[PDB]
Each structure stands twice: as structure tokens, then as C-alpha cells.
Design an enzyme around this catalytic site. Sequence first.
Site, PDB file in Angstrom:
ATOM      1  N   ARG A 175      16.630  53.550  -9.781  1.00 54.51           N
ATOM      2  CA  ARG A 175      15.816  52.330  -9.835  1.00 54.51           C
ATOM      3  C   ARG A 175      14.692  52.343  -8.794  1.00 54.51           C
ATOM      4  NH1 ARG A 175      12.626  49.301  -9.519  1.00 54.51           N
ATOM      5  NH2 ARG A 175      12.457  47.079 -10.082  1.00 54.51           N
TER       6      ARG A 175
HETATM    7  N1  LIG Z   1      11.411  47.887 -21.215  1.00 55.37           N
HETATM    8  C1  LIG Z   1      11.863  48.991 -20.569  1.00 55.37           C
HETATM    9  N2  LIG Z   1      11.103  50.112 -20.468  1.00 55.37           N
HETATM   10  C2  LIG Z   1      11.530  51.226 -19.830  1.00 55.37           C
HETATM   11  N3  LIG Z   1      12.744  51.313 -19.247  1.00 55.37           N
HETATM   12  C3  LIG Z   1      13.614  50.267 -19.274  1.00 55.37           C
HETATM   13  C4  LIG Z   1      13.211  49.020 -19.947  1.00 55.37           C
HETATM   14  N4  LIG Z   1      14.242  48.169 -19.825  1.00 55.37           N
HETATM   15  C5  LIG Z   1      15.218  48.804 -19.131  1.00 55.37           C
HETATM   16  N5  LIG Z   1      14.846  50.056 -18.801  1.00 55.37           N
HETATM   17  C6  LIG Z   1      15.651  51.045 -18.034  1.00 55.37           C
HETATM   18  O1  LIG Z   1      17.011  50.608 -17.897  1.00 55.37           O
HETATM   19  C7  LIG Z   1      17.311  50.314 -16.526  1.00 55.37           C
HETATM   20  C8  LIG Z   1      18.210  49.085 -16.402  1.00 55.37           C
HETATM   21  O2  LIG Z   1      17.556  47.877 -16.797  1.00 55.37           O
HETATM   22  P1  LIG Z   1      18.195  46.437 -16.451  1.00 55.37           P
HETATM   23  O3  LIG Z   1      17.259  45.360 -16.941  1.00 55.37           O
HETATM   24  O4  LIG Z   1      18.627  46.461 -15.006  1.00 55.37           O
HETATM   25  O5  LIG Z   1      19.530  46.412 -17.353  1.00 55.37           O
HETATM   26  P2  LIG Z   1      20.640  45.241 -17.309  1.00 55.37           P
HETATM   27  O6  LIG Z   1      20.035  44.081 -16.559  1.00 55.37           O
HETATM   28  O7  LIG Z   1      20.854  44.976 -18.777  1.00 55.37           O
HETATM   29  O8  LIG Z   1      21.829  45.871 -16.630  1.00 55.37           O
HETATM   30  C9  LIG Z   1      15.961  50.204 -15.824  1.00 55.37           C
HETATM   31  O9  LIG Z   1      16.039  50.536 -14.432  1.00 55.37           O
HETATM   32  C10 LIG Z   1      15.102  51.167 -16.618  1.00 55.37           C
HETATM   33  O10 LIG Z   1      15.240  52.513 -16.151  1.00 55.37           O
END
Ligand SMILES: Nc1ncnc2c1ncn2[C@@H]1O[C@H](COP(=O)(O)OP(=O)(O)O)[C@@H](O)[C@H]1O
Lengths: 469, 57, 462, 462, 308
Positions: free
Chosen positions: A340
Site C-alpha cells: 500500500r
Molecule cells: N480502483 C482501483 N484501482 C486500482 N487498484 C485498486 C482499486 N481498488 C482497490 N485496488 C487495490 O486493492 C487494494 C485494497 O483496496 P481497499 O479499498 O483497501 O480494499 P478493502 O477496503 O475492500 O479491503 C489497494 O491497495 C489497491 O492495490
Amino acid sequence: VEVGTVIQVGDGIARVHGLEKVMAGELLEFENGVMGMAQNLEEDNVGVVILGPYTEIREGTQVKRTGRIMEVPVGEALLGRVVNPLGQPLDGRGPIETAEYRPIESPAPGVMDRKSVHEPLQTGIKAIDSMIPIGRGQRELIIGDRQTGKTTIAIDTIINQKGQDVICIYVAIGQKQSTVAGVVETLRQHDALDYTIVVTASASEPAPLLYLAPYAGCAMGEYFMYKGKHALVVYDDLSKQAAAYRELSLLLRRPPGREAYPGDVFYLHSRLLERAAKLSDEKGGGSLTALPFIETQAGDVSAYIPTNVISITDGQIFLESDLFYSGVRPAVNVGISVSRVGGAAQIKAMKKVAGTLRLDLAQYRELQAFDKATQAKLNRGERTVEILKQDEHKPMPVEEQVISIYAVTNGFMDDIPVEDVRRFEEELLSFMRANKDSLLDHIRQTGELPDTKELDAAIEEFKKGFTPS
Amino acid sequence: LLDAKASEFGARMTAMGNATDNATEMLETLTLQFNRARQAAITQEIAEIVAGANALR
Amino acid sequence: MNKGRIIQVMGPVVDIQFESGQLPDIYNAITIERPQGGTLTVEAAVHLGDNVVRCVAMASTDGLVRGLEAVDTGAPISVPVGKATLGRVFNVLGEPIDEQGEVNAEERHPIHRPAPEFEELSTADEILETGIKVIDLLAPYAKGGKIGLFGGAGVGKTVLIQELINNVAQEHGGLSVFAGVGERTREGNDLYHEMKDSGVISKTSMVFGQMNEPPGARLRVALTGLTMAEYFRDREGQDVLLFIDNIFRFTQAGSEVSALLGRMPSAVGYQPTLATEMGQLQERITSTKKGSITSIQAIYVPADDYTDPAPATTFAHLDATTNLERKLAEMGIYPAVDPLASTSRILSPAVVGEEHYRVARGVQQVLQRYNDLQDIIAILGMDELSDEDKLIVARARKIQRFLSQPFHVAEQFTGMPGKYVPVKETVRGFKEILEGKHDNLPEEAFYMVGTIDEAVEKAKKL
Amino acid sequence: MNKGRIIQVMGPVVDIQFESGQLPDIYNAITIERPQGGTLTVEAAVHLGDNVVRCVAMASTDGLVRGLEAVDTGAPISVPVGKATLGRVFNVLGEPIDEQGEVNAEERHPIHRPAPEFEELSTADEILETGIKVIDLLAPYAKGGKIGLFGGAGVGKTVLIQELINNVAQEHGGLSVFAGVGERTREGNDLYHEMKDSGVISKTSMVFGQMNEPPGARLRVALTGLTMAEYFRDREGQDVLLFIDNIFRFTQAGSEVSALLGRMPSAVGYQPTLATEMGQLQERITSTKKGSITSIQAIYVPADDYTDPAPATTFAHLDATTNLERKLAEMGIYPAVDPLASTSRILSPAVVGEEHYRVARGVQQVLQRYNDLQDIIAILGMDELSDEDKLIVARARKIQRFLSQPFHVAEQFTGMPGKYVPVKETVRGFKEILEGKHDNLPEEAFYMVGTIDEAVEKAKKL
Amino acid sequence: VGKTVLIQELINNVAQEHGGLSVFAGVGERTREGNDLYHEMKDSGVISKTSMVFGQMNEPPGARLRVALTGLTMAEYFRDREGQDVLLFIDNIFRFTQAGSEVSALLGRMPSAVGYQPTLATEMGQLQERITSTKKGSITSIQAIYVPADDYTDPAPATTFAHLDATTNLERKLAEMGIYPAVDPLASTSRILSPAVVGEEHYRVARGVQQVLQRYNDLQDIIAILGMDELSDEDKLIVARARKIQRFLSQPFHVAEQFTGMPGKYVPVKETVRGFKEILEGKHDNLPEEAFYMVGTIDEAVEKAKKL
Ligand SMILES: Nc1ncnc2c1ncn2[C@@H]1O[C@H](COP(=O)(O)OP(=O)(O)O)[C@@H](O)[C@H]1O
Ligand SMILES: Nc1ncnc2c1ncn2[C@@H]1O[C@H](COP(=O)(O)OP(=O)(O)O)[C@@H](O)[C@H]1O
Ligand SMILES: Nc1ncnc2c1ncn2[C@@H]1O[C@H](COP(=O)(O)OP(=O)(O)O)[C@@H](O)[C@H]1O
Ligand SMILES: Nc1ncnc2c1ncn2[C@@H]1O[C@H](COP(=O)(O)OP(=O)(O)O)[C@@H](O)[C@H]1O
Ligand SMILES: [Mg+2]
Ligand SMILES: [Mg+2]
Ligand SMILES: [Mg+2]
């Protein structure tokens, strides 16, 4: 002293009469020196979890207050020492002489207490440092099947902190004691032990000690964080801790849910890894980096406990089994592994050279399971794979990594055969260290990449001397 | 015709060789799903029996 | 010492009330005299309150009466150790079941104890040379290691067990222990006589926790065998062998005891103390500074599911697997160890040498290639194969025959005398075959011999 | 102020004995002075009998002793409301955690209250343009409506809600409220400074009760932020945006307290009051005649199981749903929105128009047939498909890639700059794909672009 | 799937021209169906031969637990005391077990597997073993048996199998196609399916039908992915005849005219055996599939093919 008497006991869980003024979560000591934890304060009695062997504890056995909240010893006295979750020494090198103590349960830094992660924690492993870079204060999950190289990443990361002024804490939870003894011996041989604390709760140890082990190691890391220094904590592994906490919860007859785990199993890990952070300038600027382990079954990342820890950490490093048992070590799955923090955890040279390296290899592996344009990408892909392969217990300095990755990505190894790439790398760095040391030293001091034209000539100068198969 | 027939049967080797490799990949995925459900079913069944027994006592 | 009264008898569970301030410790053996002759031993499990102790029975509870005297022995189930145990067959309580007279041991040790301390443990992996070419090369055993033994009925499981006992005793001077967890009485009788005939009886102590005994007996029987193995490690410094058949039935017994005690079940109906019980057994099997206990363990896999909690928890401790294949036994390739499916954690340049690892991997790559071409060869023919493959196929067939070996225990079956082949000779032999030094020799020459010199010696006779 | 004495402490649950006649009501805040300094706030839950109240602690109970004094405040947990909360960061108790001095607010409103009356309610029948192609086309959000972002671990819930903050909340006339419920404290620190630089903070009240906090705090922290949003809605007549990440954590924290309250568990170990607790919270999050609340809530899906009681019961409280899926995320399709499982109440000719509706259902008809062919395509590929299905699969794969889109918030990860696609362009783009107007263009041209014009332009340099 | 429609058809076919007496027990089922059956038996005149008992799903569990015994006691009288044959119709016997399961935990009994009472087999046996023929008299018992969740492994229907001489196993997949009655041709069994009772031709034709339908099921999963034309000429002919046999096993019922939309048909045994024999021999290979669907005799299938 204020005394109590055991009235019921079974499976290391006791009910004690007396202890009128005892605190919730207080450390207690039985007749025979074994320690205990006052979990529940009932109307007429106290619930006590035994934190050690319970084959000499019975009805009639006496237990006393310590007057202290559940805590462990901390500080420089534990450096180079092997301890259990209570801080008692297992190495047989005398007692832990220390005045500093910290509580097992402790609040995480607030919203204003933190700062964004911007400082590299170099693992010394090319695949990780380039594609999934870890920063100081980050939480990065290491996840994968049995025997996929999880512990080796942690030990090599710890070895690479020699001369970097970073305190390391290897927490072994539910592992074989053979392997922990092997780990401490490996750290002794690589001169990594004198800045490392080893907390161990083996598979023969009762479940409450496996449960407490990560929090004891966290407290030991926290001491250095809040005093302005930087620390690294490794939980190997949280699947054993989760299973150990499930045993305790089922013995206490608490309502089970998904895979028989209790409802606070997410909270078990979430409060642990929240305490790992990067503090602000007001709070001293120290940090605690966390590398929690999860051991999957048949590569199932969608299971209950794996999805809990993915939901806590700042990305993850998945280790693929098929790659690991076909020459590719470390077996990093580029498709689903991510950091991240990313570029903020890398120096300028590594960020620029390995900017799109993860997605390029993710594309290569997709094209592999399947023209002239795509043929060039397959040939480039095979050669970059050989560079990211690396022997165990052999960390690489960041200046040497960026030079090696620069060479392969810009096409200086295309005319060289695939089988000679590993030798080409090794001999190129010997040439670079001995003769062209000013190029490497420029990366060490500034962090930025050297002159493009000067570096290209230095690589081409080496290629004249090299001889392929 | 004979050369076209050689190309036909060679093309069938490759296509059905892939279909065999794809079937083994899917068969593993289904075996993971089955054993996920088998373990979940036994966990749920035994939990309901023990929950029912504790309600009486 | 403490004396009590039976207040309840509920299947294999017995609640015993003791006097105030004088109760038995957990895991203590408690003897109860039967009204119709004999003695029942029970193990203290839970302290319920009001000076009442819930106990797990090691034999039948039929004939018991409320109010009978129960005597606390003051320690766990204590069993005989040392050379008096050799050539004898025991039960969970350390009593002889062979009807072969007195067992005059000097000491008796408790079966419940902690694992070795951190300071005692060995700090590096060392190979245990079995003398068996296929195992030592491709899936080597580690000192203090745990090996998963897989194989069907009638493939050479019992013969391999007897050969490992013989070879470690003959060359390393390390004795053995066999723990029959859930032993079928018919098969225990057969195994006793089979070990008498081969002569390995004198190097082994046998302990049976038979199928028809209570869950408490089958749960603790591995600890009885383990305690006998620990004496020879700790006192006499030996590299000991500990056979456990079947390790699943140890877990099964724990689940059954857990159900009797009334604990809440965990995932897939297993006991909540699944990992703890397995770990407390397995961690005691290890390499110390003085010696080691290496354990070969037969493992049942429920529903052929390796992710199931029983095998998954067991596999957490394993260092290798010896996978016996029926098709190799049908070809005459004994021992019928699958050279591709069998694996080992210590097959690396760190533990064994760089040469060992190179040769072992070369053998695997050649045998894997030969295995892939079986469908192509059967239909298309040998002319379909390229010049590179034809040579690989020829060497693979020689390699597969050189992996076979005549056993000291199997002289009756094969006819020839047995062979112990050192690691260096095994590495050298398969190295020379891969390099192409023995390409011109016939394939029968490599079949059923010890060293590479014996293969060359066999070639002139053909 | 009536006094009480602690009788029991059981994790986050505390039993307190009060004198007869002075018994605190359910949901009342109760303060306890710690022996280690500081005050612990505690919330009354159950009346056990004998003037004993079982309560839920809002912070840690470690250090508490039996017999300590407890003070009934005489009302529920009360928190600041109005203009003083704007630009400020709060905790569950309504105390400032931003270190910007005291919050000079006139009124303190209780966090517990009944839902609005039937006659007060206002139905949301108007589209809210997000600028995201999958949402706007296939499952559009409503102004003053209830929106849910479903997803498993690491699929993209927080990235999506942050993109919706970027696209919707920056150019918003009214006020905003963010609630951090059981998520990363780091992300709250990121979003604070992210909103502070952009200037949106001055019209935004923030509340945090993150995954570090005990279950009582995670249970009630959403109600603290909700009460602030209710004041802007009813009293000031404002258009409020309510962002919650993650609402599942409120249900999860409810299960943790429910265990130590002693309630019997329901399906999958959840609290029996799961639906009622969720409804009492959710029904307050609504638009009224006086003002509107447009709520966007992240909803965690345990182990990717949508049939889990928590996400299953959440579906009833939503006008539009964005159903994220791991399979799409692992393919590189971001946002990973399931185009068939994602639904909306306002996808009809009356709201979005006839062309929008026809194109939306046309896309779903193509994707539904593509979904039906997955078992065949997995084994045999696209070689045995009919000419009609070959065209459908070809159009489906292009549709699937044009549904992806680069995000402004995801610039740090991917490297591509973000794109905002208007509704007219989204409808036009997928219409042209359905009509076979871009059959000549390759698949990667449709992947990660804004308008259909950018896909035409991308195809040239490819 | 069709238990009530089947038992009502067996009343219409068997009990209409029955010389002896009858008993119907409505056990935990729909009250509408009790009213339907009563007025149907009143119109046909069968009511005068039949004693009816009802304890339906509106009633509390205790009523549903003991109502079958009330009906059985009346049937037991006609067996033992009077010299006359008895037909005992029960719809649905599962509801006896379910009624016992409802009261079980309130009686203080710990639960068994799948939420059932621990005394499932004993309670079932002590009721079931009374339902029988003796040396004194003959009871032909026909009992509807609910299979919860279509799961034949469920303890209730699994335990019931021991108490039967013949079993009609209904399956939803046949009913989902429109094959009524939705009888599983393989899983349905009988103690009297042998050459000694039904003759050598009947047994051979019946066994021939089962082998053709067994082979069709083995090919269904193969055909679905790899296609129809990749099979041999023998297998293609087996698939064609199996689908025609499966449709000729369907039949329109007298009691199900409001569901089928056509008149019901009675088919004699010798006529049935003749029909399926000619299909196995290959005499109707040129008739389309729909011709075999929803008819009585094989002659009606030849007539139906002309309409298509
Ligand atoms: N729209 C997007 N474009 C590119 N990568 C994404 C996107 N959404 C999520 N990711 C990838 O997935 C990871 C986790 O996203 P996150 O929103 O933290 O998931 P959650 O909140 O559902 O656990 C991000 O750090 C990124 O690498
Ligand atoms: N990069 C590497 N190169 C060679 N061997 C490795 C490498 N990484 C790990 N190994 C070896 O592979 C085995 C598995 O590694 P380990 O870290 O123990 O995995 P885990 O902890 O997941 O079981 C160990 O024997 C280790 O020595
Ligand atoms: N090493 C060997 N050499 C020759 N024959 C063997 C060997 N091992 C096993 N066999 C043959 O296989 C038979 C079965 O062996 P055994 O060990 O009893 O198998 P299991 O224990 O699996 O039933 C023996 O009777 C013998 O004929
Ligand atoms: N023999 C049949 N012919 C036509 N339709 C039938 C037949 N049997 C059942 N069905 C259809 O299925 C429905 C359910 O039948 P019913 O006997 O009530 O099922 P159950 O097995 O639940 O008693 C009927 O109302 C009818 O529509
Ligand atoms: Mg490890
Ligand atoms: Mg998130
Ligand atoms: Mg019915």
C-alpha cells in the site's frame, strides 16, 4: 500479601475464591511459581487462566496478587536473549536484569499521533524491495502455504538490518522449537542476534502462552518506538495464535462461529497490528514495522482468518506454492501481492528503475500460459525472472539491487543466454564493486540513480570481458 | 488431403491436450470447494447439536 | 498418599471424590480394585469442585460400584524403560502382554512430561543414513525428524519398517520403538511373529493400544512408546527410531476423550485441544545435544482431504514423506518407494552437499521426463521420441532399477543377501549413470544390487 | 447524581449494583473513576434483577476492581451537534481527538433515539452522477438515497468510497459527515490530511472508532456521527453526505458484546438481535421532508460469503448496491464491480430515460450469456461455440473491459491519471459497443479508459 | 413432486373396485386436500367403504403425533375382528416424526442428528410394525413420505425405508421436465420384481429399460461438454430410445386433469410390458419424442405421432 484459593480447575482454566481487591487482567502467582491471568471478576469468585504448566495446580492450591497489570520486561536487557511470553529466559544465560516494564494490553497511537510512512525498511531481497517495498511503520502480511518460504523472508530481513540501528523481535507462536533453535543459531552466524529479541511459545506450550506471545513481542517493540528508535516485529505465525485463542474460547464455552472461531477473532489481530505504526515528529518520530504470518491451506486466501488479516494489514506478500517448487525462490505472486505504501517506502533510484516491474511480470506470467512482438516480452521476462531469484541468507545492498534490475530491464542481458543470467549478475556486481565503486557510492549517499550514459558504458565495458556458455 | 488430415489430428491433439489440462485445473478448484463445504457442514451440524444440548442444562 | 470414593460411573468416565486438601494432580494414575478381581487404572482429567475429580478410564468400567476405594499413585502412568523393554510387547500402562515372564527394569518413567528445554536442543539439521538408496538420495530422513508413511495394503510397509530397525541398529547402534495406536489384535500378533522371524525383535520394544480398548488407552499409548524411546536418547545418547501407526487414531482418541469430558467441539467436530495435544506429543520427538528420536508415522487422511484439521495439524510437524506405490511393487521394484512423490525438507545444498542435491534433482528430472512420455511411447512408439529423449528413457529405466535394493529382512522373498549402501556410494552410483558411464550395460545389471560396483560385477554374469 | 457499586467485570461487560429506586434506564451513560486515573464511560444494557444493571463498556475494563463507585449521568451518551462539529475530529463519546482545543457547542444530543415517523419520510427518485461507468449505467445511486459498497478483503471498498468522496463531495453545496467504524487508524489520518489540503474539511464533521478500539466503541461510534448528521438534516434543513467505512464492524462489535452479555447465539455464531440492532441504526440514516441524507456505506463480506448473516441482512436497507468481487479484481478489472449482482431501485425508464434503460439491460443480456458459457469456455475455449455465441463472447469481453476505469484516488498505485465519465458518454459508449460499431478494435483498447473516444484513440497506438 | 396426486390416483384406480374396506388418515397435511378428497369420495361412492381421520398442519404437534394411530386402530379392527381386506392410505407419515421432533426438546430430550429426536427409530418402528398384514387379515398400506430438502439421506426418510416392501421414489428433476408421475426408474424398488412373480418377459423388459436409462445417465455429463456427434452409433441409438422410454414412462392421471389439461388414462400391465418391449426392439424409432409423452398405450403414441 493478599491470597486466594482454587475451588475448580480444568484444561488450564481455574476458578479462584478470595482475591477480593484483584484487578481485571492482573498478573497472579501460584504456590509453585507458575503465573496466572485474572480474566473475569465474578461476584464471589475470580476466573484465572494459567500461563504455564498446570499439572501441579488443583483445588486447595493457593494463588497471590502481584498488584500489576499483565505485563512483560522490556529494554536492552532482552537483546540477544531467548524468552517465553512472560519474559522468562529459555536460553539459560542467567536472568533478565531490567527495571523497565510494559503492559501486554496497550492502546494504539491515535489519529493525530501518526505520520505517513516515508522511510525504507530494506529486506535485502530483490523481489520484495523492488515490487512490494516495506516501509518503517508499515504492516505487511506474509501469507502462503506450508513450506513456501515465509520464515526465510523474515530472518533474511532481520539479518539485513545489521548496522542499520533497527531492533528486531522474532515472535515464534506454535512453531517447532527445533526451528526456533535453528533460527537463533542462524542469527548468531550472521551477527544478527545482538540486536534481536526472540519470543517463543512452542507447539508443546499451553494455548494461553501462544495467545499472549504476539502481544509480549509487540510490547518489547513498542518500548523502542516511543523512545524515538525504530523496531521490527515478526509474528510467525498468527494462524497458530488464532487457533490457540479458539481453544481458550471453546474451553470457556463462548459461542463459536465461522470455522468454530469466536466473534472477537478479528479483534485479536486488529488491536495487535494497530499498535504497529509510524509516529509523528511531536511523538519522537519512531516506528514499529510488523510482519504478521498467515499459513493458508491449499492457497485459499479467501478463508476466514486470511481475509481478517488482509483486512488489517497495508497489503500482503503472497507466496505461490507452484512457483516455489519449480526453482522460483522467493516465490512471490506478482498478481495478488501488493504494498500500500509502495513508492514512498523506496529510494528514488529503486522507484524509477522498478516502477512498472510488478505489472510487467504479471503480464509476462499471463502471456506465458498461452507472433514477434510478444516473443520479445517472453525473452525479456525469462531473464528478469532469473534476476529476482535469490539464495537464502544472502541479502543484497539496495545500491547493488538497483544496478542489477537496471541492467536487465533496459536490455543489457538480451544477447546473453537465460541459463547464464544468474552468473552474469554475480560477476557484473564484482566488476561494479571493485572498479566502478563511485557509481554504487552515489546511490548509497544521495539515493538517486547515477548518470545514464556513464552507467551504460560501465555495463558495456563488463560485457566485453564476459564469456557465455 | 493426407497432409490436411495430419494437420487435423495434430490440431485435435493440442486442443484436447489443453482441454485435459483445463479439466485437471477445474477438478482441483471443485475439490477445494467440496472440502470447504464438507468441513463447514460438519462444523455447523455438530455446533447445532451441542447448542441444543446446552439449552436444556 | 490420597484415597477416594467412586461417586459416578458413566461409560468410560469415572468421578472420584477425595478428602479435603489431598487431591490427585492432573494426569495422575489412580488405581481402583475391581470387586471381581483385577485393577482398573484411571487418569485424572478435571477438578470439578467439592473435592471431586473426573477421570478417564484406561480399561472397561463394567462391574464398578459407587463407594469403592480409589488410590492415588502420586504420579502419572509410569512405565518401564531401558534394555528390559527390548523384545517385549506392552500395553498403555507399561505391563507386558506377551506372556513372556517378568520385565526387570531398574527405573520407571512417567509418560506425561514437558518437551525438551530450548538449551538442550540441536541447532542444525543432520541426515540419518538409513542405508536405503531411494530414501537417502531423494527423500532423506533427518535426525529428530518426523516422516509421513503412505501406502496401500501389501506394498512393503511392514518390511520397510523392519529394515529401518535393522539398519539403524546394525550401523548406528540406535534401538527402536513401535507404538501401535489403535492396533488390530490380529495384526499385532502377526507383527510380533514377523519381527521374531526377521530378528529385529531384539532391537525393538513394542507397545499396543488396541482397537478394542477405551479412548483414554489409545490416546496415551503413543506417550508410553515415546517414553521408552526417550530413555535411549537421554541416557545412552542414541539416535532412536519411534514408529507410530496410526497417528490419526491418536487424534481420533483425543476427539473421543474430549466428547466424553463434554467439551465444546472445534472445526470439523475435532477437539478444541487439537494442536496442543499433537504438539505436546510431537515436540518431544526431536534432536537434542545428547541424541535424537526420529519418527516414521503412518497417517490416515479423512475423505482424502489434506486440508482436514487432523492431517493439516500433523503435516505442520512433518519433515519428509515416504510414499509407497503399488505399481512399483507389481514391477518387482522393492522397496516400492515413489521417487517423485516422496519428498524431504532436508534435500538441499545446506544439509546434504552440493553434489548430493545436484544428483538427486538430476534423477528426479530424468524420471519425471520418462513419466511424461509414457502416453506418447505407448501409442506413437519409440521412433516418435527425439534423440535426446531416447537416451533419457534408457537412463531412467536404469535409474529406476538402481533405486531398487535387496533387504536384510526380505532375504526370504528375494533370495539374495541384504545390502546396506552408504550415502556417498548412492550419490556416486546415480551420478555415474547420469553422466553416461554405464549406458552400454544391460538393464538387469542395475536391478537388485547395492553399490554401483555390484552392478558392474553383475554385468559379466549376464 | 445516584451512586452504584461494581459487582462483576467480564471483558467489555460490567454489572453494577444500585440502591432501590435509583436504577438507571437502558442506554444511559454511567461514569466510573479508574484506580489508575481517568474516567471510564459505560452504557446500561440489561436489568438483571435485584437492582443490578448489566452494562457495556465504551473503553477497556482492565484495571477495574469490584466495589468501585459508578455515577449515573441520568441520560444516554450525549455528543456535540451543529456548526462547532464542522472541521473537527471526534471519538465515540463526542470528545475532540484532533488537539484543536475545546469544541464550543451549545447543545449535546443523545446518540440513542427512535427512528423517524412514517409521515416524515421522503423517497429518493433522482439520479446522482458519480462519474463511474459501471455504477452510473448498471446500478445508479440516488440523491438522498441509501448506497452500499459490498466487498471481501482487499477488493476495493475504501478506494471506491474515497473516489466517491473525490467525485461527489468536493463539488457539493451542503455539508458532509465521515464515520470511521472499525477500520485502519492510518486511513483516518490519511483522509484528515487529504481533506485538509483540498479544503473540504471545513464542511465535514469526522468521527473515528477504529479497529484498535474495544467492541463497545466500535458498536456505538456510528451513532455519534449519525446524530451530527441528523442535526444538519432536521434543524438546519441541509443536504448531508454520510460516509461510513465500515458498517459491518458495527455488527461484528455487536457479536463480541453479545457473547459476554450471555445471549444465546444465532446462525454462524452471530447475536440473536442482529436484524433489530441493524434496523434501529439504519432506519435513522434516511432522508426526510426537512432535509436529505445521501448515505454511502462500505460493507465487509466475511470470507467472500455474501450469504453470511451480516451482509445478507444489510441488503434490505439499501436503494443501490455496488457488489465488488475478487475474481474481477485479480483480472485487473477495477473497480471490481459485479455488473449483474449490483442492483439499483432507480434503474428504470421513468428516472434514467428509455435509452439508458435499454442500453443497460442490453449490456446485462450480453454478460448473462457470457456467464452461462463459462463452464464450456473454461474447458474447451471459444472453438466449439456457435457463430452467434462467438460474437456475444467477443462483445462481452470488450464490454467487461470498458466497464473498468482509472480512478483519481488510484493514481498512486497504477500510475494512470483518473477519469470522470459523464452519464451521456457512458450510455453512448456501451450503445456503440452493443451495435457492433467497434468490433474491429482490439480488446486492450477498451481497458482502463474514460470515454469511447479514448478507446478509439488508444487503439491507434497499439 | 407428486405424492398427494399419486396417492389420490391410487385411490381412484385401486380402491374404486375394491371388495373390502378402506381407511384414510390425513396426517399433518393441507386441510383443503381433505375437503377435496372427502367430496371426491362422496361423489364416486367410495366414502361408504372408507373411514376417514384428519389431524392436519393447522393442528398442534400432539394432534399430528397421534392421529395416525387413531386411523390405524380402525384399520386394525377390520383386519383382526372382521374377515375382510383393508386398504390403509396415509398422507403424510413424515408428519408423525416431525410432530415428535417438535415436542422432543420440551419433553427434556437432548437432540440427535439433523435436529431430530433421539428416539426416531424406536418411535417409528413401534408405529410402523403395527401397520402390517397378519395371518388373521390383510392390510395393503400405501403411505406418502415427505423427503425434506429433496434429501433422501435425511434421517426421517432414510429410517422409513426399512418398513417397506415397495418404494416409489419421486425426484424433482423429472417433475422439472414435465415427466409425471415423476418416478425414479432406477431408485424405485420392489420385493416382487422377479421372474417367479411377474414372469420372465416382464423382468427382462423391466431390466432392459433400467440398463438403457442407466447408460443415458452415464452419457449425459459426457454429451453436455463434448457434444452429441462424438458418440458411437450404438450410444446415439441408446440416447434416442432412452428419451422415448422416459417419456412413455410418463402418464396422464384421472385425478390430475386440471394440471395436465387432458383426460386420464388407465393402462393394463400386459399392455405396458408390450409397449416398452417394442421400444427396446426398435419398432418405434421413427416416431418423435413428443408422441411418447403423456399417453396410455403404445397404440396411442402411434396415433399421436400423426398429429405432429
Ligand atoms: N480502483 C482501483 N484501482 C486500482 N487498484 C485498486 C482499486 N481498488 C482497490 N485496488 C487495490 O486493492 C487494494 C485494497 O483496496 P481497499 O479499498 O483497501 O480494499 P478493502 O477496503 O475492500 O479491503 C489497494 O491497495 C489497491 O492495490
Ligand atoms: N530463496 C530460497 N532459496 C533456497 N531455499 C529456500 C529459499 N527460501 C526458503 N528456502 C528453503 O525452503 C524451505 C521452506 O522455507 P520456510 O521459510 O521454512 O517456509 P515456511 O516457513 O513457510 O514453512 C526451507 O527449508 C528453506 O531453507
Ligand atoms: N523389500 C522387499 N523385497 C521383496 N519383496 C517384498 C519387499 N517388501 C515387501 N515385499 C512383498 O510384499 C509383501 C507384503 O509386505 P508387507 O510389508 O506385509 O506389506 P503391508 O505391511 O503394506 O501389508 C511381502 O509378503 C513380500 O512378498
Ligand atoms: N401426475 C401428475 N400429473 C400432472 N401434474 C402433477 C402430477 N403430480 C404432481 N403434479 C403437479 O405438481 C403439484 C404438486 O403435487 P403434490 O402431489 O401436491 O406434491 P407433494 O409431493 O408435495 O404432495 C400438483 O399440484 C401438480 O401441479
Ligand atoms: Mg516457518
Ligand atoms: Mg478498507
Ligand atoms: Mg402432499
